[PDB]
Design a binder for this molecule. Sequence first.
Ligand SMILES: Nc1ncnc2c1ncn2[C@@H]1O[C@H](COP(=O)(O)OP(=O)(O)OP(O)(O)=S)[C@@H](O)[C@H]1O
Ligand SMILES: [Mg+2]
Lengths: 240, 419, 209
Amino acid sequence: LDLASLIGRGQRGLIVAPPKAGKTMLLQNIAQSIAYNHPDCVLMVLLIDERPEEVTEMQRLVKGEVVASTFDEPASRHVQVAEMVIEKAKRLVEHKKDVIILLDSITRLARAYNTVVPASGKVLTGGVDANALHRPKRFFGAARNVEEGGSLTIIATALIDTGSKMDEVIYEEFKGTGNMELHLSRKIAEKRVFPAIDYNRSGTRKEELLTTQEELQKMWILRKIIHPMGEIDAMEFLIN
Amino acid sequence: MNLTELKNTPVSELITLGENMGLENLARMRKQDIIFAILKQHAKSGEDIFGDGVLEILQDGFGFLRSADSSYLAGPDDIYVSPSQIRRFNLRTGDTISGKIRPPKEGERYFALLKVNEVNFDKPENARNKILFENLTPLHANSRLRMERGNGSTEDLTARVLDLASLIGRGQRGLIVAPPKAGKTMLLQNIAQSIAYNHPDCVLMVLLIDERPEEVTEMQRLVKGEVVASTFDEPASRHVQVAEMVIEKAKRLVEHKKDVIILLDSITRLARAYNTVVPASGKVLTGGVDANALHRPKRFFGAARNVEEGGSLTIIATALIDTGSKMDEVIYEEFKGTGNMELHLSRKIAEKRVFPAIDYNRSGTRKEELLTTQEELQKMWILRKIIHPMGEIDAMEFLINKLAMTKTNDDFFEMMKRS
Amino acid sequence: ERPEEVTEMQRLVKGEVVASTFDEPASRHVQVAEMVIEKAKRLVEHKKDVIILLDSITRLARAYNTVVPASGKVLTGGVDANALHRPKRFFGAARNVEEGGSLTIIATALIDTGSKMDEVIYEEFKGTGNMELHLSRKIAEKRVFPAIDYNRSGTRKEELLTTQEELQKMWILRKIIHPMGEIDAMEFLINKLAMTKTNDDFFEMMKRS
Ligand SMILES: Nc1ncnc2c1ncn2[C@@H]1O[C@H](COP(=O)(O)OP(=O)(O)OP(O)(O)=S)[C@@H](O)[C@H]1O
Ligand SMILES: [Mg+2]
């Protein structure tokens, strides 16, 4: 529940969910957990291009300010609210104060950038511009910890398997750049923890004759660590 | 003698009135021109008469007033609205105005407006101070739209089927997805006449675009509420301006703490028309559709909401599925997930002629807890448990079978629980 | 100009004004032009600052072209090089002096009139001024005044006029206002400058934002 328990202080993180998986109330619970457990930190709930009633519910069931953009207006509103929230976050960093950002959703912001960014000829499979990639990279890497005083941290929300093709490319590049990524659905858990790409690469050579410790480096530890819920197992991918 | 009475009357009354008092060769011109000419000739006696219609403002400051029976068409029947009227009665688009009209003197062709006597079915003076729609606060669909008609046909059986499969709320935002030849138009009928029979208090509005003329004329003579429809013969701008003016008129109506329901068939056609008419932005997606084109129908759909302090705006819009054209998909997943409820249909159920063809498992609603009570929520959840296992066609056959012998939905519930 | 607005602006502003009516020939417009510029330059030469406001340079150039005899070198549309030569010198007379004095000139030009004369003078004159303030009619539909768009408005040599604090804050405003929409920019600027009393507090409230 507590953000320090889940996201800690100063480090970025993601949560990824499919449609019809329980996003709104989970974000609500995270919001009041932040409000009660750490009232000192400045709450910041943000929404992009979703139904106005849920925007009102979010901004009415929490205490922090909720700058949100409903799904009526075009994506220029979304992009410019993105720069202005990141600039006010930077100002609060210069203000020597911790902030928490609940953004929903980064896939929405990314493909809004994709459909708004001017054409540059660097498109890829699916017409994804490179600018619409490293501008989100700049926004997502601006969430670095403050080493001089205080600590900014953000919790990310992403949507998966929405019946489209644009979302999984940005999902896999977030996987490439992700710090921690909470998961809800079934298959993508195994997709991440046991990379099918790496499994196929290994199986192409079958049991590769890894000499000496190279074979023993790949280790898997399951420790039934003590948890307040009671004996929640923790599984770790030990490498050399 | 208002414009509405002679506008609504058929050709026989028009030609009889023309030949009675001295109209020559009046049978060979378009009906709007006929009513214009005959009403001008009658008003040449200087008798002020009442008027009715919906106003709109073009690029210039001058405004026009149209009639509902004319399918919101710009023609000779249009009524002048001077900008001075806009200032002196804070007029904005979509306001329904009733008042004395002015016969045309030399220099003008149409009819002006002498005075205003009823603005939005209300006194013009007390409506000067009013709350704008922009700052209104959205809310959930707390009020259930009980559309169970209880008349005693299999059409009522379809009504009960979507009662048991959907939760229609007052002020919600709904999407319907179905393949062609599945039962969309008369499902919308079901909705229309069920609302008319069960909820006469709320006004019913049915918007039809690029539909066949026979469907339009059978829809106009079947629904109790007023219906606006523009066929495919007219260009894209016709449909676009119809949709804009009707949605903003519903906005003005719901601003008066009124319950407005708009049945749209379809929304994909509206998106196609908007893409056709909108200037190109240079950022085209798959299927020849650019980015900014989809914004307009998409804010159009987003206009639906429920007002906390009074009034509700419900939009039930249909979306085409698997028609073989890529842009139909493009719109399908562009609007997917933006509605308070989704209603899915399958063509294979219609192939075996089991009707309706609603996919029970796929159909769903958002925030059922606030809309209904806990007891009926669990009572529908247990049906979801028992009907989820077998196939959707088998599910519908089972449901219609053991619902045919049952008079109402409640008795169906207490007849299932004992089993 | 019509008499009414001329008389009105005569006692809105305390500065001396010379105005001429349309019906009288353009020759007297030319003469009053040379006397006003000559007295202005004499006052500048006396180490005294001069500020001139003019409306409109391209249309008075049109009038001069109509009244000047044709030298025989006819450009496109009947324009003559000597026809635009005199207005060109008139506009270029603006000349700051390091020894002393100044001759600031602020002239306006009119475009989108249906006759391409004013256009031809526009692209013959643009780029010859130390600043430029584009203005468009697209703002007056929404009834917002002034109609001064900011993205494509610019000036030459900002680095010398004032301190780089104002420069950097103006740059921040530019970069937060340029990519975003034009009508959006106009409403944003009018609102954000509405409740703020002064420009210093306005810069401060961007800085805190
Ligand atoms: N409840 C019902 N009662 C009677 N006939 C029904 C019912 N449901 C479906 N049908 C039959 O379904 C057929 C197709 O219905 P339509 O409403 O015309 O299909 P559609 O989904 O509207 O697709 P369009 O309008 O042709 S593009 C008709 O021949 C109806 O007789
Ligand atoms: Mg039909």
